[PDB]
């Protein structure tokens with residue numbers, strides 16, 4: 446006695462399989478999943494005929510497809526994905542201030558923050574799965590997106606986390622090929638020393654929340670004792686994330702796009718999101734608070750951008 | 763033998779090669795085509811990363827086969 | 838080759854390393870001196886994030902360069 450089922454890795458290619466009812470799925474396809482449920486150990490029922498099954502890639506076609514789907518070489522991705530999905534499917538994703546958030550549960554504030562942030566950024570995801578889940582998230586269904594975020598970050602549900610790290614791990618799979626940043630360092634006698642950065646490295650900074658301070662100058666310790674001045678020469682990208690250790694900072698109306706606040710210590714803390722349009726909107730999970738201006742311990746500030754050139758000029762000393 | 767080389771952003775290019783050509787050779791041809799240093803190139807096929815030593819005829823690469831190219835910028 | 842590491846309190850320390858040392862090593866060398874687990878340890882050069890994979894020579898960290906030490910947030 447046999448049954449006809451389908452096995453897939455990308456939810457696009459459904460590979461026909463004549464499953465043996467005597468043996469379990471585990472003994473045939475390996476670790477299997479039916480709608481997020483691990484049925485690797487249970488044997489095939491007649492009920493399950495015609496249904497689609499999610500497997501780990503075990504041959505060249507499945508490996509190729511799975512890679513083309515997830516843009517990762519790690520074959521264990523699906524496992525963590527489903528493991529997270531089983532939980533994210535339960536989270537509630539209300540619409541707050543024209544954006545999809547998440548009800549506080551399982552320390553998801555940083556996920557909620559990166560989600561809210563991403564919805565306000567102009568970005569393309571290169572991984573089909575991630576892009577689809579992103580669109581679905583913007584629509585209102587963001588369980589799969591969260592699960593994928595957890596998967597790509599090697600973080601499990603419930604774990605506390607850093608918004609910046611997650612943002613990095615995500616933007617890895619974002620389309621920032623044309624994103625270009627060039628900076629310049631100047632000392633007293635060490636002259637001018639320029640640097641070029643691309644991709645994720647061209648839209649991330651960790652040292653100051655202010656975008657202007659990057660254009661004006663930043664005091665960085667140099668070789669010859671005296672502090673050198675670092676300043677942004679050129680920034681060709683859609684947006685810029687400026688981060689720093691959690692510090693008291695005053696947010697103003699027309700100075701940025703959105704930002705993240707982190708209240709607490711390096712032991713345990715809570716994230717809150719700030720987005721600016723008419724007034725300033727503070728999103729705390731499912732809760733919303735309108736505001737005139739925010740003075741608090743903020744860690745990440747996002748700025749919109751197109752193409753920027755400088756006024757600055759060096760002086761060969 | 764014509765083959766495709768595609769980036770994760772979908773940017774694709776075409777290369778005339780042979781089953782005899784090694785990975786370093788196609789990487790060299792990539793360098794010759796678009797000017798990407800062979801040291802930064804990571805090629806992928808069948809969901810597996812390719813080693814600079816072996817050749818296309820080992821990884822079962824037919825004609826009009828698509829190789830996935832991702833970049834590993836030094837530093 | 839000595840290099841400077843600036844903690845969050847401003848307390849600047851010095852480490853003996855070689856350009857061949859990966860970020861992991863230098864990240865581990867801070868543990869035995871400051872007692873900080875590398876898992877919660879994050880190193881930033883000139884506001885540019887550094888990762889465990891590559892090395893000081895890759896990121897172009899030369900003699901007596903100054904790195905900034907930060908910890909991963911637990912939100």
Ligand code: NI
Nearest residue numbers: 633634635762
């Ligand atoms: Ni002088």
